[PDB]
Structure formats: C-alpha cells, structure tokens
DNA sequence: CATAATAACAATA
DNA sequence: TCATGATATTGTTATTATG
DNA sequence: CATAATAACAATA
DNA sequence: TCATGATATTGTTATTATG
C-alpha cells in the first residue's frame, strides 16, 4: 500500500496528444490523470469516496456499457499507479445492480439471437473472397482473408498470431494448423494463454501459412507485430472496418452489416459443419476451436449467430 | 421477526415415523426438529451462531452435495417455523467456497459429457417400448411411457401434468400437445409456473392423451395426483427405478444404467432431430421444449447427453 | 435363521 | 433449475424391525 | 468555404 | 471472455484542427 504514483500510459497518451493536427480533446484521459494526481497523498477512505463520487457524477449521461468501460479504465489506471493493494480499488467500482443488469441485457441479446438465426446464404462467396484476399499483396487484405480462413480475432491475426504446420501422423495436416497467441485470456490458468493448440482451417494449410509469412515479412506487418490493443485500434480499426464493409457489401446477409468479427462467427459454423466429430457437441466444438477457458461452454453461446443454407434446406426436408 | 414457531412438516414426519414397521431412524429430521425447538426464544445472534455451528460440526463427514441438501432442509424448516425474515437465515447457510466448488464440479461434469456424447444406438427400440407402455393397464407403465413420449419429468407425469389437444389451424395437431404443471420453477416470474405451453410428442397425440386419461382415472392415478415431492418419492421412486431398470436393461447404451430422467434427455434429442425449425439453435429448442426460465440457455447444456446413431453415421460421412 | 421397509445419504438441473 | 446464493427435484444405499 | 484525424462514445465476448 | 465482479477486445460517432 503506497499513496504515491503515476499512471504512465495515460500521461504518455496525453503528452503525445499535445501535438494533434486534428481530432477530439482527450477529456476522459485528462479526467483520469487528474483523478490519479489527486489520489496522491490520500489516506482517508472518506476523501477517496468523495473523489470517486465526483467522477461518478461526471459520467452521468453516458450509456451503461460506456460507464462500465470507463470504470475499467479508471481501475486499470489505479492499478498502474498505485498497485493492486490500493483501497481505492474497493471504492472505484460499479454498483452490483449495474453489472447484474449488464449481464441480464447481454444474456437477453444472446437468447434473442438463438431464437432467430440468420441464414448466411452466400457464405461460400464470402469464404471465396477471403481465400482471394490470401493472395493479395496488401497486408490488410491478407489479414482479412486470415480472419476468414483461420477464424482468429483481428488483433490476433495482425499483432501476435503464431501459425505453424500441424503434424498428421507422419506428415502435415491439410485442413488444420497449430496456432499460438490467444487473446483476452487475462492470463487465467485454465485458458489458452501461451498455449499452442490445433485449429481447423477453411482452405489448404499451405496457402494459409504462406500468406501469413507474406503478412509478417511485410513492412506494415512488422509495424503491426507486437502492438498493444490501443496502438492496433488507433492504427487500423477504421480502415479494416471500411475495407470489410466494401469487400462483402453485396454478399453478406442483409439482416446485418458485414463486420470483421462476423468472419470468426461464420468460421466456427462452417468449421463445425465440416470437421466436427460425432461424439462432441456444437458448444464443445466451438469452445475447442475458439480456444476458450477450460470447462466453459457458455461463451460459445455468443458465437451461434448464423445458420448455413444447406442446414436450413434439410431442416425443411425433415418436416 | 418472531422468536417462536414450529416446523410442522418435520414434526408430522416424525410422529408418523413413530409407527414404523421397519427402516432407519429419522435422525436428521430429529436433529432439525431439535434445532428449531432450541431456536425458540433465541435473540442473541451469537447463540444462533453457536447452535448452527454445532449442527455444522455434526454434518462433518457427509459428502458436499449431501451437506448442501441438508442445509436446504434446515433453511426450509427455519422458513416454515419462523418465516423469511428470521436472522438465522443469514447464519444457517453454506460458506461461499462450498457453493463455488459445487458449481465448478457440476460445470466440469457437464463439460466432460459434452466432449464424450453417448451413442444411443437402440433409441428406436426404447421409444417403441415406451409407446407399448402407453397401452398397458399398469398406471406405472403408462407413466413411464409418458416420460418417454412427452418428455415430462416423473413428478410432473405422475402428480401434476395437464395434457390437452394442441390446435393446428382449424384442427388438432398430431405431433404436439399442450402441457401445464411445470416443476422446479420456484415460482419465478420468468418461468413456466402456471403456464400452459405447447410441447412436441414422439407418438400420435391421440395415444398420449388417451393414455394419460387412463392414468388419471386409475386408482393409483388418483392417489398420485396432487402429491408432494416427498410423498411421491417415498411412494414410487424405488419401484419406478426398478421397473425402468428392467424394461430397458438390454437396449439401453452400455455406458450407463437406464434411469427414468434419461428418457427426458433422449426425448429432447429425438425431438430436436425431428421437429426443430432451421432458425433456432439446439440450446434454444431444448430450452423451449423443456420449459426453462426466460432467456436461459445454460440449463439446456445439462440435457445434451446422447448422440443419435444416424447423426453419428453422417458425421462420419462428412469426413 | 433373511428380506422388505424406511429414511439417510447422495447426485443432478 | 433459478439465479449467479442457493432450491427442487431425481438417484443410491445403510439401517432398522420383524415369525 | 469541408474533409480527415483523433479520441470519445459504445457494444460484444 | 474470464469469472460469476468484472476486463479485454471489437464497433460507432462527435468533435477538433487545418490552406
Ligand atoms: Cl468448401
Ligand atoms: Cl419415429
Ligand atoms: Na443496453
Ligand atoms: Na463431488
């Protein structure tokens, strides 16, 4: 328990923002910096409570998810400046009802999607487009194609993925590769953090591996590699978004706009349709190929979004 | 907040047990009765804590699930004698780690089953046997057949089920009926408590309805109707168990012994295989036909236990 | 000289 | 299963009384 | 006289 | 997503500087 410290990343972001040619003012980051600064020398939890109450009063008007995210930012700043043992971490948090309601809403959305799956009629054209993106010389395109083919998250694909040949007996597997660099694990001991596991691919493994080699050895590929989530977001998010919008504009199901992470969802589906052994559930297979926490099947629920046109067809054959 | 009261059901069970021709002594019920008796006049929470600590010390040696169940019994007794506002309800409970570990174990079991589904090779013979049980004159048999065909829980089937014709446009549906009397709802406002909803049946609806009419109008049927869970358990559980063991001894998959609730599991599976529309997930369909809480998909995980031989076959066709 | 009856004991949803 | 701090079911076995 | 750049704002897993 | 009290990602839009 120290009473002194500074949140380096926020301050650096501000000082970096002092040379902005355009864009918003970093007001939130400013408030966080001022918060941490005012925290220095504080010992009375009453004062801490008052401060955090001021901050809470400021965030009034924002959306629930937004407020939650901001709270996450504040807490990470506190951890960065003062450590995990600071008492403010017992004060600077959301009220229980907030997280309860967030959970309720999320589960409601998932439950709604499960009762109204979207028919991905042109999924073959999408997969085709990704496979075409594999051969492009534009690193972004190759990345998108890799999101489509390996089903790895954008951050994983662009910043930290490790793809390698998967041994099939005494040879190399054609329809699967080894992957390392799972994201969002939070370094849980039951997670795939630092674990190399085998995943299926929706095209020949040679093409995937080669394409990833072309991506890594690229200039933008060497710029991307090792990036923090903020760096990657600020650098690529909107461009990737626009490019994805434009690529699949006319083939994506009209119930929704084509977003990058959708390619992950679809992947799972297609993968399950083609490679899943008969002794496993859809939840279990999703959980396996997506690299989820040990013994978890609940996260998989979030990925059941589409239904394949053939499944739709023969589910109408049986009737 | 009163300090006086008696748990009527326990005492009545004891006084009823005073005329036992055979069987164990009601020691647990005795301890609960003595507990409630000693609670009378208690005002100091320290004393309450000491008492419940004595009880906890007694239960040492039992299994975790057992201790949990016993705690449930104690709490229900406290609620019966003193009401929901008694402070002992804040003391007479399990420590958080116990329920955490229970959850962990349960989820681990489910996750294990999801990665090793059992091939129900002879499920057609089982369904056939149930359909045969529908025409029997033995009410128990009819009940079993109804567990197999309607997929309703034993307690529901024998004690409180309300089956009725399901309207299909301007007529009666052949492959579905209306059901009322959902169990285990705990009267949640998002549950099917007191709700009549439509369920699929694995044989013609006429046969089901007729068979249930023959069951209800029976003597044992009129004895069963309206029974508490304890009454039904003590009256029927072991007989139903033995009969179920004997009926499906040679056709049930050899990975497990044939238990009544299995017929529910299987039901779901078969139902999903035959009736599920293409726009819904297996989780959602299970949740729908099993009558689960609103927006819940997690309970359905517990019912994915078997895999049908045809699915096994064509999952090996695709390979 | 042995079996059925009962509730403890236990696991599942 | 409903809620996420537990309860309500379903499943198994030791112990007891009894010509 | 208008567009791109940036971080706020927001939702998903 | 990992844990079940939240965090780490991915997705959207208002605001700002700038010949
Ligand atoms: Cl293909
Ligand atoms: Cl059939
Ligand atoms: Na919301
Ligand atoms: Na256990």
Numbering used by the authors:
A (entry chain A), B (entry chain A): 103 to 421
Quote from the publication:
Having revealed the structure of the hairpin telomere, we then asked whether stabilization of the extremely compact DNA hairpin conformation by TelA is dependent on covalent closure of the DNA strand. To address this question, we used TelA with a point mutation in one of the active site residues Arg255 that plays an essential role in coordinating the scissile phosphate. The resulting 2.3 Å resolution crystal structure of the TelA•R255A–DNA complex shows the exact same hairpin DNA conformation as observed in the wild-type TelA–hairpin DNA–vanadate complex (r.m.s.d. of 0.41 Å for the six nucleotides in the hairpin), except that the scissile phosphate-binding site is empty and nothing bridges the 5′ and 3′-OH groups of DNA.
Hairpin telomeres of bacterial linear chromosomes are generated by a DNA cutting–rejoining enzyme protelomerase. The protelomerase enzymes function as a dimer, making staggered cleavages of both strands of DNA to form covalent 3′-phosphotyrosine linkages, then exchanging the released 5′-ends while holding onto the 3′-ends, and finally sealing the broken DNA strands to generate two hairpin ends. The TelA monomer consists of two structural domains, the catalytic domain and an α-helical bundle domain, that together clamp down the DNA substrate.
